[PDB]
């Protein structure tokens, strides 16, 4: 289930960070699950990295206890946008790469969620 | 457009690497675009990392030339599967995190592809 | 008398700085009295500091002279918002603390303005 | 809600410290919430600092446990009283600065309590 | 001919940078011609520098080749806004200085464009 | 208002400096406001820099006093004329860059004069 979100820190400039907070969380505010989109330039200014990061902070136990730690379910995504290429195929091929990524997230959902390469493709 | 693929190196064990090759590519075989799924254990065996990586090798110019270099369009995805947590919410919350990732890839497609945080959500 | 202000640098993100300028000032622009609100995270991300700062730049003499220096009337306020506490009383108690602060600013106004602890409470 | 207080250490001299204790607290006496007013002279005797400090000691958990720590909700206020200025505006302008402080505590109450600069002014 | 522009990074605060991109450019995106306005404070806070910068990236050759480098046509403008002056003429005189700058850009256009001081004033 | 000028040091060679003095100034002659046009070659002889500089010397106070200092309102302009480029677009594009500079000086006049990026374009 896609988590419900509201934009906490809105986008300011084309580059930088934007953050959404997951609404309805029960944990303290500093541990509210977050989604962060990042658009950053490389040092040599050859690539722009587009990143999405989902940090879901979950307690190590079902109930509150003294040994209760905070684990983090992390889901990361990054994509390279070439900035200095003379090849006009770059845009269409970046689109194709992103679509292949989404298709594989669908195709290998069970394998990804179970940590087992041997599971067949999702139906 | 999702790229067409055929499985080149098939899965062997639950952990490790599996690779698909993009079919119909024109570049030399060592530069055939690839999709790699990785399932790896952490050192302390606390997390299993599920990764998907799309490497699309594209020439720096539209035609063949002597200064033709090979740029790489890279798209990476990773997800942490907690292995030592007593919290029974871990499975459902990892599912929710993956779904939030996919939802955000849909929601921010234009921003991700353009490298501009200020673009509105995709319709 | 509350000074009249207009927002000079508006808020950009939930954290950071916002500044208002005092309108109708006679001193040069770089010495315009300012009000600055700051929302900053701690290093360990345990607290968010909410700060208000009033800097009123006033000349050391009544008229312009060669030895005229610029003194600063500074008024600072800070409040700690706990971000990682499991105690649900934190919000109501932070509200109570802020209200106690305002009540004491009323109660001890003469003492605060005169620099004398012995003055009785304001009527 | 303004907390109820009784004067614990009364003012002795114009400079120094005076302390009030919050009545009806349940925590041990050494952790009774306190309000401290301070009137101190600068080293060069140019300023008198008038300070108010509210320390509210709150347990990290709702109930008593072995990992129960004691967090502190801190609210600080300071004001500079110039002592060596020949400008006769100093008194009225310090009054204006204090009033601006109180007005801003009213104006930005929600932002201060939430740690978010983007919240609109309180109605 | 004035180049057509669209605002890429909009102004955020009174100080900082704002950037416009030149529309309709044929070179790769990282080499899109840019116009940057900067408003920065001096270290001693005596001056505010207002700057405009036009960076036009142009290939060293008319056609694409392996030795094709990227030259930059740079046009810079700066103006000092005094922030701590008691002279009330500062505003009108800064206006006069800016107008003299524009008048000289008109008067010496041919000389500026040809790199020859001896050319007569433009008609 | 464009300042009135008379040519003090006339142009001698295509490269070098030419200076105009602002007429009707009240300050001593060594502090007469000046406009300087410079045409200089780069070390590697790749660029010719065309520069215009307006130095307006203004007293720090409205009247004569013993602490009266002399501030300088500085307005600088520079343009790069490529000297070793085989691209025939260089001339037209340098013209376009200069026109973009003038257009932006018109477009952002209020922002430039106020030191505030947030001001809207001039009407």
XYZ file of C-alpha atoms in Angstrom:
738
model
C 0.000 0.000 0.000
C 1.349 3.379 -1.045
C 1.836 5.433 2.103
C -0.056 8.737 2.463
C 2.223 11.769 2.357
C 2.110 15.540 2.679
C 4.884 17.818 1.474
C 6.893 18.977 4.510
C 9.814 20.831 2.889
C 8.761 22.054 -0.569
C 11.086 22.399 -3.567
C 13.041 25.634 -3.583
C 15.384 25.453 -6.591
C 15.724 22.918 -9.435
C 18.646 21.359 -7.550
C 18.556 20.386 -3.896
C 16.153 18.379 -1.729
C 12.391 18.126 -1.282
C 10.782 16.104 1.515
C 7.359 14.593 2.169
C 6.241 13.273 5.552
C 4.125 10.142 5.943
C 0.876 11.156 7.622
C -0.766 9.300 10.491
C 2.429 7.935 12.011
C 2.456 6.962 15.679
C 6.186 7.285 16.401
C 7.704 10.558 17.708
C 8.032 13.376 15.156
C 11.792 13.053 14.670
C 11.078 9.477 13.541
C 8.226 10.280 11.136
C 8.739 8.239 7.934
C 10.015 10.435 5.121
C 10.324 10.502 1.342
C 13.160 12.653 -0.017
C 13.713 13.637 -3.646
C 17.207 14.906 -4.471
C 18.486 16.580 -7.645
C 22.247 17.066 -7.461
C 25.027 17.946 -9.901
C 28.237 15.986 -10.229
C 31.590 17.568 -9.412
C 32.657 17.660 -13.067
C 29.065 18.691 -13.957
C 28.744 15.702 -16.285
C 25.724 14.090 -14.595
C 22.668 15.211 -12.688
C 21.625 12.573 -10.165
C 17.872 12.239 -9.608
C 17.248 10.338 -6.371
C 14.217 9.178 -4.400
C 14.656 7.833 -0.868
C 12.051 6.311 1.446
C 13.096 6.080 5.102
C 10.549 4.209 7.246
C 11.541 4.126 10.918
C 10.097 1.064 12.659
C 10.625 -0.122 16.258
C 12.554 -3.346 16.734
C 9.733 -4.791 18.870
C 5.953 -4.862 18.602
C 5.472 -3.036 21.922
C 7.366 -0.406 23.885
C 10.259 -1.789 25.921
C 13.580 -0.650 27.344
C 15.609 -2.514 24.690
C 13.418 -1.103 21.907
C 15.677 0.086 19.092
C 14.709 1.847 15.870
C 15.417 0.014 12.636
C 15.146 1.766 9.277
C 13.526 0.288 6.184
C 15.417 2.094 3.406
C 14.408 2.144 -0.255
C 16.690 4.067 -2.625
C 16.439 5.002 -6.303
C 18.880 6.945 -8.469
C 19.037 7.898 -12.149
C 21.839 9.576 -14.112
C 20.893 12.426 -16.470
C 23.823 13.062 -18.808
C 24.430 16.802 -19.163
C 27.324 17.050 -21.647
C 26.496 14.404 -24.261
C 26.089 15.330 -27.925
C 24.090 12.148 -28.593
C 20.442 13.053 -29.170
C 19.338 9.560 -28.068
C 20.090 10.412 -24.425
C 16.581 11.607 -23.550
C 14.674 8.711 -25.115
C 17.163 6.203 -23.714
C 16.927 7.640 -20.188
C 13.153 7.289 -20.532
C 13.628 3.690 -21.680
C 15.946 3.001 -18.731
C 13.431 4.379 -16.225
C 10.675 2.296 -17.822
C 12.884 -0.801 -17.641
C 13.426 -0.060 -13.945
C 9.676 0.143 -13.300
C 9.041 -2.989 -15.375
C 11.638 -4.903 -13.361
C 10.174 -3.685 -10.068
C 6.924 -5.240 -11.276
C 8.543 -8.362 -12.755
C 10.659 -9.256 -9.706
C 8.428 -7.983 -6.885
C 8.292 -11.278 -4.982
C 12.030 -11.882 -5.376
C 12.817 -8.338 -4.199
C 10.502 -8.606 -1.193
C 11.721 -12.075 -0.176
C 15.463 -11.701 -0.783
C 15.537 -14.786 -3.026
C 16.772 -14.632 -6.629
C 15.235 -18.018 -7.451
C 11.586 -16.960 -7.191
C 9.882 -16.832 -10.609
C 8.695 -13.581 -12.128
C 5.532 -12.136 -10.660
C 2.435 -13.090 -12.716
C 9.601 2.272 -23.303
C 10.581 -0.780 -21.289
C 13.613 -2.320 -22.961
C 13.393 -5.923 -24.224
C 15.573 -8.321 -22.251
C 16.629 -11.959 -22.190
C 18.187 -13.625 -19.168
C 21.944 -13.952 -19.778
C 23.205 -15.217 -16.401
C 20.363 -17.008 -14.590
C 19.895 -17.100 -10.810
C 21.969 -19.763 -9.108
C 21.379 -19.344 -5.361
C 18.998 -17.111 -3.366
C 21.906 -14.716 -2.788
C 24.181 -13.418 -5.516
C 23.613 -11.824 -8.927
C 21.348 -12.426 -11.914
C 21.751 -10.565 -15.213
C 19.557 -9.851 -18.229
C 20.869 -8.488 -21.524
C 18.976 -5.927 -23.594
C 18.225 -7.502 -26.963
C 18.696 -5.802 -30.319
C 21.575 -3.566 -29.272
C 23.939 -2.239 -31.929
C 27.021 -1.591 -29.779
C 29.742 -4.256 -29.312
C 28.845 -7.164 -27.011
C 30.943 -6.010 -24.053
C 28.812 -2.845 -24.110
C 25.405 -4.546 -24.347
C 23.006 -2.786 -21.933
C 22.412 -4.896 -18.840
C 19.978 -5.280 -15.958
C 21.438 -6.826 -12.797
C 19.493 -8.023 -9.759
C 21.557 -8.505 -6.595
C 20.584 -10.148 -3.298
C 23.348 -9.705 -0.732
C 23.705 -10.149 3.028
C 25.153 -7.528 5.326
C 28.351 -8.174 7.265
C 26.518 -8.390 10.597
C 23.736 -10.332 8.795
C 21.167 -7.763 9.917
C 19.946 -6.746 6.444
C 19.509 -8.357 3.061
C 19.951 -5.795 0.295
C 17.751 -6.306 -2.771
C 19.151 -4.280 -5.673
C 18.230 -3.674 -9.306
C 20.683 -1.904 -11.614
C 20.201 -0.811 -15.224
C 23.415 0.039 -17.083
C 22.767 1.465 -20.566
C 25.992 2.162 -22.459
C 25.514 4.958 -24.998
C 28.113 6.602 -27.275
C 28.964 10.224 -26.565
C 28.231 11.172 -30.195
C 25.494 10.315 -32.673
C 27.945 8.781 -35.170
C 31.224 6.896 -34.962
C 34.260 9.130 -34.492
C 37.757 8.967 -33.046
C 36.802 10.972 -29.932
C 33.719 8.800 -29.378
C 33.537 7.895 -25.691
C 31.047 5.629 -23.935
C 28.808 7.233 -21.341
C 26.686 5.127 -18.997
C 23.071 5.847 -18.104
C 22.818 4.264 -14.644
C 19.582 3.595 -12.772
C 19.905 2.034 -9.312
C 17.376 0.688 -6.808
C 17.956 -0.834 -3.378
C 15.701 -2.099 -0.585
C 16.600 -3.259 2.930
C 14.993 -6.481 4.202
C 15.464 -6.643 7.971
C 16.520 -10.149 9.011
C 16.770 -9.958 12.821
C 13.743 -7.872 13.820
C 11.118 -9.244 16.201
C 8.546 -6.715 14.954
C 5.914 -8.513 12.880
C 5.112 -5.288 10.988
C 8.380 -5.553 9.038
C 6.933 -7.451 6.068
C 3.862 -5.268 5.544
C 5.910 -2.109 6.067
C 8.576 -3.187 3.559
C 5.724 -3.779 1.111
C 4.370 -0.310 1.904
C 7.829 1.213 1.393
C 8.238 -0.456 -2.007
C 4.770 0.737 -3.026
C 5.632 4.271 -1.899
C 8.771 4.068 -4.046
C 6.763 3.048 -7.121
C 4.127 5.707 -6.411
C 6.821 8.382 -6.188
C 8.448 7.200 -9.416
C 5.050 7.805 -11.005
C 4.345 11.051 -9.128
C 7.690 12.733 -9.871
C 8.485 11.268 -13.303
C 8.940 14.616 -15.058
C 11.021 16.045 -12.207
C 13.225 12.932 -12.137
C 13.725 12.952 -15.908
C 14.423 16.698 -16.104
C 16.591 17.163 -13.005
C 14.323 19.927 -11.675
C 12.654 19.696 -8.257
C 10.233 22.517 -9.090
C 8.228 20.655 -11.738
C 4.715 19.772 -10.519
C 3.634 16.193 -9.970
C 2.895 14.199 -13.091
C -0.852 14.170 -13.915
C 5.430 49.788 21.661
C 5.620 46.869 19.259
C 7.759 47.947 16.324
C 6.233 47.912 12.817
C 7.754 45.263 10.566
C 7.582 43.982 7.004
C 8.885 40.589 5.946
C 12.229 41.086 4.167
C 13.429 37.494 3.677
C 10.412 35.155 3.646
C 10.417 31.564 4.917
C 11.720 29.080 2.384
C 11.771 25.691 4.139
C 10.507 24.550 7.564
C 14.078 24.844 8.859
C 16.289 27.874 8.360
C 15.841 31.617 8.889
C 13.148 34.201 8.199
C 13.712 37.938 8.666
C 11.504 40.998 9.105
C 12.762 44.572 8.818
C 11.550 47.370 11.083
C 9.915 49.998 8.888
C 10.485 53.736 9.170
C 14.038 53.537 10.481
C 16.350 56.508 10.001
C 19.721 54.734 10.187
C 21.474 53.417 7.038
C 19.983 50.258 5.502
C 22.695 47.886 6.729
C 21.708 48.992 10.246
C 17.934 48.607 9.844
C 16.553 46.909 12.990
C 15.703 43.280 12.304
C 13.656 40.414 13.714
C 14.925 36.931 12.841
C 13.095 33.649 13.412
C 15.274 30.528 13.270
C 14.246 26.862 13.193
C 17.303 24.624 13.436
C 17.967 20.940 14.106
C 20.459 19.679 16.646
C 23.494 17.666 15.581
C 22.123 14.441 17.074
C 18.661 15.452 15.752
C 17.218 15.243 19.264
C 15.964 18.844 19.490
C 14.612 21.477 17.151
C 15.504 24.951 18.391
C 12.891 27.643 17.734
C 14.493 31.071 18.125
C 13.368 34.686 17.834
C 15.950 37.480 17.824
C 15.397 41.242 17.819
C 18.454 43.310 16.874
C 17.867 47.062 17.261
C 20.882 49.110 16.165
C 21.015 52.443 18.002
C 23.698 55.167 17.841
C 25.752 55.734 20.971
C 24.915 59.463 20.919
C 21.759 61.479 20.326
C 23.252 63.331 17.337
C 25.747 62.527 14.601
C 29.375 62.871 15.676
C 32.785 61.487 14.779
C 32.926 59.229 17.863
C 29.402 57.943 17.183
C 29.403 54.166 17.608
C 26.556 51.722 17.020
C 25.297 49.804 20.027
C 22.922 46.866 19.638
C 19.874 46.236 21.805
C 19.561 42.442 21.583
C 16.544 40.424 22.701
C 16.778 36.643 22.299
C 14.285 33.807 22.772
C 14.768 30.070 22.307
C 12.596 26.993 22.849
C 13.507 23.300 22.621
C 11.121 20.997 20.729
C 11.984 17.400 21.611
C 11.975 15.244 18.476
C 12.750 11.727 19.757
C 10.706 11.466 22.962
C 8.100 8.736 23.407
C 6.345 10.742 26.140
C 3.036 12.058 24.804
C 3.085 14.924 27.336
C 5.820 16.700 25.358
C 3.480 18.838 23.244
C 1.235 20.041 26.070
C 4.240 20.639 28.320
C 6.080 22.658 25.656
C 2.906 24.734 25.346
C 2.852 25.151 29.129
C 6.524 26.180 29.120
C 5.944 28.817 26.432
C 2.945 30.148 28.363
C 5.035 30.294 31.545
C 7.645 32.275 29.604
C 5.047 34.802 28.427
C 3.520 35.011 31.912
C 6.937 35.733 33.416
C 7.679 38.385 30.791
C 4.485 40.052 32.000
C 5.104 39.381 35.705
C 8.692 40.682 35.801
C 8.536 43.421 33.149
C 9.821 46.211 35.398
C 12.591 44.034 36.841
C 13.666 42.933 33.349
C 13.669 46.492 32.006
C 15.505 47.953 35.015
C 18.077 45.216 35.652
C 17.006 44.880 39.299
C 15.796 41.571 40.749
C 14.328 43.288 43.816
C 11.514 45.129 42.030
C 8.086 43.650 42.846
C 5.988 41.910 40.229
C 4.261 44.162 37.739
C 0.632 44.894 38.749
C -1.334 26.866 30.298
C 0.870 29.012 32.502
C 2.384 26.753 35.143
C 1.698 27.507 38.829
C 4.789 28.665 40.703
C 5.919 29.639 44.184
C 9.095 31.583 44.875
C 11.739 29.147 46.169
C 14.864 31.340 46.303
C 13.819 34.994 46.662
C 15.730 37.963 45.232
C 18.590 39.101 47.424
C 20.349 41.902 45.519
C 19.500 43.724 42.265
C 21.993 41.463 40.477
C 22.068 37.694 40.793
C 19.452 34.943 40.517
C 15.894 34.384 41.717
C 14.098 31.046 41.354
C 10.486 29.871 41.391
C 9.450 26.225 41.664
C 6.519 24.767 39.738
C 4.003 23.486 42.273
C 2.237 20.136 42.092
C 5.002 18.287 40.267
C 5.189 14.507 40.547
C 8.890 13.990 39.785
C 11.521 13.889 42.577
C 12.395 17.250 44.159
C 15.766 17.650 42.436
C 13.815 17.492 39.159
C 11.082 19.985 40.088
C 10.506 22.314 37.100
C 12.043 25.722 37.726
C 11.870 29.304 36.494
C 15.042 31.350 37.004
C 15.408 35.106 36.548
C 18.989 36.360 36.219
C 20.316 39.930 36.268
C 24.027 39.975 35.471
C 26.607 42.608 34.536
C 28.959 42.296 31.600
C 32.716 42.110 32.111
C 33.281 45.595 30.681
C 30.118 46.732 32.543
C 28.571 47.905 29.274
C 25.438 45.726 29.408
C 23.164 44.270 32.043
C 21.671 40.989 30.855
C 18.111 40.299 32.017
C 17.336 36.602 31.561
C 14.373 34.311 32.188
C 14.811 30.539 31.956
C 12.176 27.810 32.224
C 13.553 24.307 32.810
C 10.841 21.622 32.696
C 12.217 18.152 33.436
C 10.113 15.457 31.763
C 10.693 11.677 31.663
C 11.545 10.164 28.296
C 8.710 7.624 28.652
C 5.101 7.802 29.796
C 5.653 5.290 32.619
C 8.517 4.360 34.919
C 11.058 2.017 33.343
C 14.722 1.110 33.665
C 15.699 3.003 30.488
C 13.731 6.068 31.613
C 15.870 9.152 31.010
C 15.107 12.766 31.890
C 14.776 15.196 29.009
C 14.647 18.946 29.599
C 12.260 21.334 27.873
C 14.254 24.585 27.954
C 12.852 28.032 27.193
C 15.304 30.944 27.374
C 14.893 34.719 27.133
C 17.526 37.448 27.341
C 17.504 41.236 26.975
C 20.417 43.689 26.889
C 20.129 46.860 28.995
C 22.786 49.316 27.823
C 24.497 50.924 30.819
C 26.977 53.386 29.269
C 25.024 54.938 26.388
C 24.467 58.692 26.197
C 21.494 58.215 23.851
C 18.279 59.013 25.718
C 16.275 56.778 23.347
C 17.718 53.651 24.988
C 14.912 53.184 27.522
C 12.001 53.647 25.116
C 13.724 51.515 22.483
C 14.410 48.681 24.944
C 10.708 48.833 25.815
C 9.867 48.701 22.103
C 12.204 45.726 21.627
C 10.598 43.799 24.494
C 7.143 44.558 23.090
C 8.260 43.369 19.647
C 9.478 40.151 21.279
C 6.100 39.560 22.943
C 4.246 40.443 19.734
C 6.336 37.936 17.783
C 5.768 35.230 20.396
C 2.068 35.795 19.749
C 2.409 36.152 15.966
C 4.504 33.009 15.409
C 3.173 30.755 18.184
C 2.244 27.847 15.910
C 5.516 28.065 13.974
C 7.528 28.170 17.214
C 5.653 25.218 18.712
C 5.828 23.104 15.542
C 9.386 23.854 14.403
C 8.191 24.920 10.941
C 8.938 28.378 9.524
C 6.314 27.983 6.792
C 3.255 28.047 9.058
C 1.257 31.282 8.679
C 0.978 33.796 11.489
C -1.349 32.860 14.311
C -4.824 34.428 13.878
C 19.646 40.818 -30.398
C 18.561 40.273 -26.814
C 18.498 36.534 -26.199
C 15.208 34.892 -25.148
C 15.271 33.603 -21.579
C 13.116 31.718 -19.099
C 13.748 31.722 -15.365
C 15.371 28.397 -14.417
C 16.265 28.950 -10.744
C 13.952 31.606 -9.276
C 14.917 34.071 -6.535
C 14.628 32.630 -3.053
C 15.902 35.326 -0.671
C 16.962 38.958 -1.230
C 20.588 37.785 -1.231
C 21.898 34.894 -3.290
C 21.625 33.890 -6.952
C 18.892 33.757 -9.583
C 19.398 32.154 -12.999
C 17.692 32.352 -16.387
C 18.326 29.900 -19.220
C 18.513 30.964 -22.862
C 15.747 29.158 -24.729
C 16.150 27.420 -28.074
C 19.800 26.484 -27.641
C 21.206 23.575 -29.633
C 24.141 22.623 -27.392
C 23.784 19.987 -24.626
C 21.867 21.088 -21.517
C 24.918 21.500 -19.279
C 26.121 24.067 -21.833
C 22.862 26.028 -22.137
C 23.697 29.768 -22.114
C 22.825 31.327 -18.770
C 22.172 34.704 -17.174
C 22.890 34.898 -13.437
C 21.946 37.740 -11.098
C 23.806 37.796 -7.776
C 23.149 39.902 -4.671
C 25.893 39.366 -2.102
C 27.041 41.079 1.092
C 30.620 42.065 1.781
C 32.564 40.510 4.647
C 32.527 43.732 6.678
C 28.895 44.256 5.540
C 29.807 47.644 4.071
C 28.714 46.929 0.483
C 26.091 44.863 -1.273
C 27.334 43.743 -4.682
C 24.677 43.544 -7.403
C 25.996 41.449 -10.293
C 24.703 40.289 -13.669
C 26.613 37.644 -15.625
C 25.939 36.310 -19.120
C 27.728 33.054 -19.964
C 27.260 32.019 -23.610
C 28.926 28.688 -24.387
C 29.914 28.473 -28.058
C 31.822 25.696 -29.871
C 35.286 26.547 -31.144
C 34.357 25.349 -34.654
C 31.342 25.788 -36.909
C 30.680 22.032 -37.108
C 31.134 19.058 -34.804
C 34.672 17.676 -34.753
C 36.979 15.761 -32.437
C 39.039 18.862 -31.562
C 35.873 20.878 -30.897
C 36.348 22.823 -27.666
C 33.851 25.034 -25.851
C 34.716 28.705 -25.551
C 32.746 31.014 -23.268
C 31.598 34.511 -24.183
C 31.441 36.175 -20.756
C 29.782 39.511 -20.016
C 29.961 40.740 -16.413
C 28.395 43.683 -14.579
C 28.736 44.713 -10.940
C 27.484 47.633 -8.846
C 28.305 48.574 -5.247
C 25.405 49.542 -2.960
C 26.833 51.260 0.117
C 25.113 49.969 3.257
C 26.701 51.986 6.090
C 26.950 55.508 4.658
C 25.271 58.448 6.385
C 25.340 60.488 3.159
C 21.807 60.787 1.783
C 23.164 61.317 -1.753
C 24.104 57.628 -2.005
C 20.846 56.483 -3.613
C 20.623 59.210 -6.258
C 24.334 58.896 -7.018
C 24.133 55.107 -7.417
C 21.266 55.731 -9.840
C 23.422 58.274 -11.679
C 26.317 55.797 -11.817
C 24.113 53.056 -13.278
C 22.748 55.504 -15.854
C 26.295 56.556 -16.762
C 27.144 52.874 -17.239
C 24.205 52.367 -19.612
C 25.007 55.601 -21.464
C 28.606 54.476 -21.961
C 27.504 51.044 -23.178
C 25.538 52.938 -25.821
C 28.254 55.529 -26.507
C 31.129 53.055 -26.949
C 29.282 50.061 -28.425
C 31.474 49.741 -31.521
C 34.686 50.190 -29.528
C 33.568 47.590 -26.970
C 32.569 45.084 -29.652
C 35.732 45.580 -31.727
C 38.346 45.808 -28.965
C 39.644 49.141 -30.291
C 39.716 52.281 -28.132
C 40.231 54.527 -31.165
C 36.801 54.003 -32.733
C 34.603 57.117 -32.449
C 31.475 57.165 -30.328
C 28.484 55.363 -31.763
C 26.106 57.763 -33.582
C 20.497 60.474 -14.374
C 23.436 59.919 -16.694
C 26.343 61.949 -15.354
C 27.895 64.642 -17.582
C 31.418 63.787 -18.703
C 34.307 65.242 -20.676
C 37.160 63.156 -22.034
C 40.206 63.675 -19.789
C 42.678 61.112 -21.170
C 41.815 60.373 -24.815
C 42.342 57.022 -26.550
C 45.867 56.531 -27.821
C 46.003 52.996 -29.253
C 43.303 50.349 -29.828
C 44.417 48.668 -26.593
C 44.896 50.473 -23.304
C 42.787 52.895 -21.260
C 40.644 55.952 -21.949
C 39.186 58.114 -19.174
C 36.356 60.631 -18.876
C 35.904 62.962 -15.909
C 32.497 63.820 -14.465
C 32.020 67.569 -14.799
C 30.694 69.850 -12.075
C 31.980 67.816 -9.142
C 32.530 69.538 -5.806
C 35.112 67.180 -4.285
C 38.878 67.776 -4.716
C 40.302 66.985 -8.168
C 41.997 63.726 -7.174
C 38.515 62.518 -6.184
C 36.691 63.616 -9.350
C 34.336 60.792 -10.425
C 35.733 58.932 -13.417
C 34.651 56.606 -16.210
C 37.390 54.347 -17.592
C 37.187 52.205 -20.726
C 39.815 49.463 -20.991
C 40.697 47.235 -23.953
C 43.232 44.604 -22.922
C 44.609 41.384 -24.404
C 44.819 38.121 -22.517
C 48.169 36.502 -21.769
C 47.575 33.670 -24.246
C 46.032 36.255 -26.634
C 42.797 34.259 -26.762
C 40.475 37.014 -25.497
C 40.265 40.777 -25.661
C 38.567 42.157 -22.560
C 36.406 45.243 -23.117
C 35.743 46.932 -19.772
C 33.853 49.994 -18.560
C 34.304 51.207 -14.982
C 32.498 54.020 -13.170
C 34.173 55.187 -9.953
C 32.077 57.750 -8.050
C 33.838 59.014 -4.924
C 31.325 60.131 -2.291
C 31.970 61.363 1.273
C 30.787 59.134 4.096
C 28.858 62.038 5.664
C 26.594 64.766 4.322
C 28.846 67.564 5.620
C 32.565 68.035 6.172
C 33.848 66.517 9.409
C 37.057 65.122 10.860
C 35.873 61.496 10.568
C 34.748 62.067 6.972
C 35.936 59.134 4.865
C 35.607 58.631 1.116
C 33.507 55.706 -0.042
C 33.514 54.588 -3.672
C 30.425 53.638 -5.657
C 31.885 51.205 -8.206
C 30.095 49.949 -11.309
C 32.002 47.479 -13.497
C 31.296 45.911 -16.890
C 33.378 43.439 -18.884
C 32.912 41.563 -22.161
C 35.067 38.845 -23.736
C 35.868 39.150 -27.458
C 37.182 35.795 -28.674
C 40.216 36.309 -30.913
C 41.166 32.778 -32.027
C 37.806 31.121 -32.729
C 37.011 29.678 -36.153
C 33.264 29.837 -35.441
C 31.703 32.599 -37.537
C 28.835 32.963 -35.032
C 31.155 34.689 -32.543
C 30.393 38.247 -33.668
C 26.603 37.926 -33.770
C 26.592 36.007 -30.488
C 28.760 38.612 -28.732
C 26.263 41.205 -29.966
C 23.423 39.066 -28.604
C 25.221 38.718 -25.259
C 25.715 42.482 -24.950
C 22.051 43.049 -25.811
C 21.019 40.480 -23.194
C 23.156 42.361 -20.667
C 21.432 45.665 -21.468
C 18.001 44.006 -21.421
C 18.709 42.536 -17.986
C 19.944 45.883 -16.663
C 16.535 47.212 -17.689
C 14.581 44.161 -16.495
C 16.146 43.960 -13.018
C 16.829 47.648 -12.322
C 14.928 47.779 -9.026
C 16.432 44.499 -7.808
C 19.947 45.668 -8.723
C 19.488 49.040 -7.024
C 17.909 47.582 -3.871
C 20.077 44.487 -3.378
C 17.021 42.207 -3.264
C 16.585 39.296 -5.685
C 12.890 38.951 -4.827
C 11.733 42.229 -6.382
C 9.695 41.667 -9.564
C 10.953 42.752 -12.958
C 10.776 46.455 -13.673
C 7.614 47.382 -15.639
